[PDB]
Design a protein around this ligand. Structure first.
Ligand SMILES: *[C@@H]1O[C@H](CO)[C@@H](O[C@@H]2O[C@H](CO)[C@@H](O)[C@H](O)[C@H]2NC(C)=O)[C@H](O)[C@H]1NC(C)=O
Ligand SMILES: *[C@@H]1O[C@H](CO)[C@@H](O[C@@H]2O[C@H](CO)[C@@H](O)[C@H](O)[C@H]2NC(C)=O)[C@H](O)[C@H]1NC(C)=O
Ligand SMILES: *[C@@H]1O[C@H](CO)[C@@H](O[C@@H]2O[C@H](CO)[C@@H](O)[C@H](O)[C@H]2NC(C)=O)[C@H](O)[C@H]1NC(C)=O
Ligand SMILES: *[C@@H]1O[C@H](CO)[C@@H](O[C@@H]2O[C@H](CO)[C@@H](O)[C@H](O)[C@H]2NC(C)=O)[C@H](O)[C@H]1NC(C)=O
Ligand SMILES: *[C@@H]1O[C@H](CO)[C@@H](O[C@@H]2O[C@H](CO)[C@@H](O)[C@H](O)[C@H]2NC(C)=O)[C@H](O)[C@H]1NC(C)=O
Ligand code: NAG
Lengths: 597, 98
């Protein structure tokens, strides 16, 4: 009759009804995503609204049990995940205003239009054309026009909305005892009451700042190399001791440097390994790819596919008229129903995306025995790390030469090694400073340390000091440059893309030692080893039942995220770069600007 | 049936564990808290039946599995139901053991 025993009684009924309603909602959403019609939209909206209403009613019902008298840890976790008010703690007018400005920001970002100065009836949206000009063009003036106009004709509409969204979200977050909206975001990595694995919401800042303090020696050399290579495609525009103009980086924002590969390739006469001709040579189809992926997965000690995965999944694009949004994803409809939706062609990118998606499917199959509220990764940075280590270890030459896609001998040299390592560095290391800087800016904005008359100044000061890029045109306090990013205007967190990159290589080095690898880390293959599979399964099957600082120790041996595995992975490229910059100047000065002349 | 088969109704709440070979078909409201609810749903009072949501697109382990449980009893009856024997044949004109 105590206050603890009634919690379990409530949780049982909640679990059952929630499983049922969630399955109905997910089935409706899938039937819409694979077959676009008009009545499917309403048939999906009905089930979605029913599920949301049930969730809201159970949430407002669960407030009767005080989280202080609970003794079990699983019950306490479930209650605390259910008791959270979230939004709707505000008034009604404020909630309507918040939803309106959120939808307005999303719409402004989605359908923003810019057009030419000399032919004003030639307007281009963002996705079909702006991030294509910024991706393939090699003209300085055209890239500058695109980068300036996107921020001058769309970013200027998002500032008076962001200035209100900040205050509204800060109020909503202070209504739940969080001191700001940034602490509400960092509250995901919190762990309390375990006696040995505690983790405050304020230690994430220090951990991030201490793990970024050791990537600077490598990012500096990569920056110097990319600068010395860019001083040849746009002569007399880059200075040998200055930063890089922000429009010569590869895309609209500079998040990924991966489009600079055609300019900064180390050895341009050795083609990187790309087995696409052999697949069409042996006539591989959309099903042999997934058979090979499943074979690789079962090789390490993980179960087969559930046999309900083969008939219900959509592995090929439906032909006649079945307009379908096929963005490769893995579904978890529940009750033992797993499906995959993707438009597979016969290439190598699909051959790796199959492994990436089946990684998510295996993770979902792992923890399917936990209660309903505990079916997720340990935190927001485990799912993608697990899904990425598979595609990391499945694209090696040693693995490709055993399936049959490569010639039997195929001696490997060090030039292609450096080519591959550098192509990997432009995507892995080229985004960590950007992510860290953006999330630091957002934390300082929400916390209240950057008054609303010093937003752009501080943004560009930090972009000059941390990332190492400079703007080509002065931006006063009417612009809002971060708001022109998808994750900033659509209200998504951004610290997961930083911790995922560390967890990925931590897991890879932890598994390389159970498989007893010998050479460098970027030649690892975990296949044909039942120790790596066992170590990984000791963590996959936990879900959110345990604190993440314990699920991490059960694999790597430490509690906090580390940065040594990443440097151990990039060691050879590091030495080569350190010997290619004997004459250049490693570093930058924050005074040179492309307009100060 | 596609769309849900709501006719199978396993019970999930009871005041005590069942005894061997008993049956309980009562449908009273389970009292969880300490305040009586007088036979109506609400807070801390639930309906003790939780019908299965059967569908064809489930996974093995969530699909229906019919069950039959044969149980034998021999208290004191001398001649009862028995299994079948392969009736032999009757021979003649030979010293036989019959
Ligand atoms: C895609 O959805 C449409 C409509 O939502 C389906 O079109 C009809 O659906 C009804 C539903 O019972 C069927 O009775 C009709 O025979 C369907 N028309 C045709 C021409 O097939 C359509 O079948 C769906 N596609 C798939 C592959 O399920
Ligand atoms: C309350 O806590 C106990 C132990 O602290 C949990 O007992 C576990 O129950 C699961 C399944 O019910 C078993 O697999 C474990 O072996 C049990 N552990 C121990 C140490 O006995 C119990 O599950 C918790 N209550 C709930 C609702 O989860
Ligand atoms: C969640 O929101 C409710 C309001 O909707 C907060 O207020 C408490 O609600 C309970 C439930 O009826 C009342 O019994 C309390 O008197 C309310 N006031 C309190 C507790 O001060 C509730 O505090 C919120 N809880 C969380 C964890 O956000
Ligand atoms: C790849 O390896 C070869 C040898 O295995 C390297 O060639 C030697 O490089 C050193 C250092 O510059 C020279 O002192 C030797 O004279 C080279 N030997 C020959 C036969 O050329 C080559 O430099 C390596 N390439 C990279 C990119 O590391
Ligand atoms: C995993 O191990 C198995 C068996 O040890 C390998 O399968 C054999 O590989 C050799 C190498 O060419 C072939 O000659 C045999 O015909 C294979 N046997 C079968 C039954 O296929 C497999 O290649 C290994 N996989 C990896 C990635 O190392
Ligand atoms: C997986 O399925 C294959 C049949 O395609 C079978 O030969 C193999 O034994 C199965 N392995 C497991 C672990 O179920």
């Amino acid at each position: 009759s105590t206050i603890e025993e009634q919690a379990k009684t409530f949780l049982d009924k909640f679990n059952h009804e929630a499983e049922d309603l969630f399955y109905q909602s997910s089935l409706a959403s899938w039937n819409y995503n694979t077959n676009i019609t008009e009545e499917n939209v309403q048939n999906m909206n009905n089930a979605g609204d029913k599920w949301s209403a049930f969730l809201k009613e159970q949430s407002t019902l669960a407030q009767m049990y005080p989280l202080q008298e609970i003794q079990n840890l699983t019950v306490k976790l479930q209650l605390q995940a259910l008791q959270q008010n979230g939004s709707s703690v505000l008034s009604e007018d404020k909630s309507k205003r918040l939803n309106t400005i959120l939808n307005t920001m999303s719409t402004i970002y989605s359908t923003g239009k810019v057009c030419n100065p000399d032919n004003p009836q030639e307007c281009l949206l963002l996705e079909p054309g702006l991030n294509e000009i910024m991706a393939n063009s090699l003209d300085y003036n055209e890239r500058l026009w695109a980068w300036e106009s996107w921020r001058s004709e769309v970013g200027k509409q998002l500032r008076p909305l962001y200035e209100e969204y900040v205050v509204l979200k800060n109020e909503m977050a202070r209504a739940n005892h969080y001191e700001d909206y940034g602490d509400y975001w960092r509250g995901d990595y919190e762990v309390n009451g375990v006696d040995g694995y505690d983790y405050s919401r304020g230690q994430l800042i220090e951990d991030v700042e201490h793990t970024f303090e050791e990537i600077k020696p490598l990012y500096e050399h990569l920056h110097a190399y990319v600068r010395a290579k860019l001083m040849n495609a746009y002569p007399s525009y880059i200075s040998p001791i200055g930063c890089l103009p922000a429009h010569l980086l590869g895309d609209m924002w500079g998040r990924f440097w991966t489009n600079l590969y055609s300019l900064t390739v180390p050895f341009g006469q050795k083609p990187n390994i790309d087995v696409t001709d052999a697949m069409v040579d042996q006539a591989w189809d959309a099903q042999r790819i997934f058979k090979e992926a499943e074979k690789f997965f079962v090789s390490v000690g993980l179960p087969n596919m559930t046999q309900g995965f083969w008939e219900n999944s959509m592995l090929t694009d439906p032909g006649n008229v079945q307009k379908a949004v096929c963005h490769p994803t893995a579904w978890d409809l529940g009750k033992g129903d797993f499906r995959i939706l993707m438009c597979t062609k016969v290439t190598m990118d699909d051959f790796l995306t199959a492994h990436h998606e089946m990684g998510h499917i295996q993770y979902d199959m792992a923890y399917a025995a936990q209660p309903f509220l505990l079916r997720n990764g340990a935190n927001e940075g485990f799912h993608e790390a697990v899904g990425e280590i598979m595609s990391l270890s499945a694209a090696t030459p040693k693995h490709l030469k055993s399936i049959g896609l490569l010639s039997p001998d195929f001696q490997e040299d060090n030039e292609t090694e450096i080519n591959f390592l550098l192509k990997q560095a432009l995507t892995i290391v080229g985004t960590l400073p950007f992510t860290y800087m953006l999330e630091k800016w957002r934390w300082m904005v929400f916390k209240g340390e950057i008054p609303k008359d010093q937003w752009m100044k501080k943004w560009w000061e930090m972009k000059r000091e941390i990332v190492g890029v400079v703007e080509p045109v002065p931006h006063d306090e009417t612009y809002c440059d971060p708001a022109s990013l998808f994750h900033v205007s659509n209200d998504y967190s951004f610290i997961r893309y930083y911790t995922r990159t560390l967890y990925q290589f931590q897991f890879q080095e932890a598994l390389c030692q159970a498989a007893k690898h010998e050479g460098p880390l970027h030649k690892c293959d975990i296949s044909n080893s039942t120790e790596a599979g066992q170590k990984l399964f000791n963590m996959l099957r936990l879900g959110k039942s345990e604190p993440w600082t314990l699920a991490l120790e059960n694999v790597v041996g430490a509690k906090n995220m580390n940065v040594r595995p990443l440097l151990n992975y990039f060691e050879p490229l590091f030495t080569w770069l350190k010997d290619q910059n004997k004459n250049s100047f490693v570093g930058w000065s924050t005074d040179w600007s492309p307009y100060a002349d | 049936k596609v769309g849900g088969n709501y006719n199978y109704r396993y019970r999930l709440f009871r005041k005590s564990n069942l005894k061997p070979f008993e049956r309980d078909i009562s449908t009273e409201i389970y009292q969880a808290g300490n305040k009586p609810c007088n036979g109506v749903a609400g807070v801390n009072c639930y309906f003790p039946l939780q019908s299965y949501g059967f569908r064809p697109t489930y996974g093995v382990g969530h699909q229906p599995y019919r069950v039959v449980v044969l149980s034998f009893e021999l208290l004191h009856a001398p001649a009862t139901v028995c299994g079948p024997k392969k009736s032999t044949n009757l021979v003649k004109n030979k010293c036989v053991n019959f």
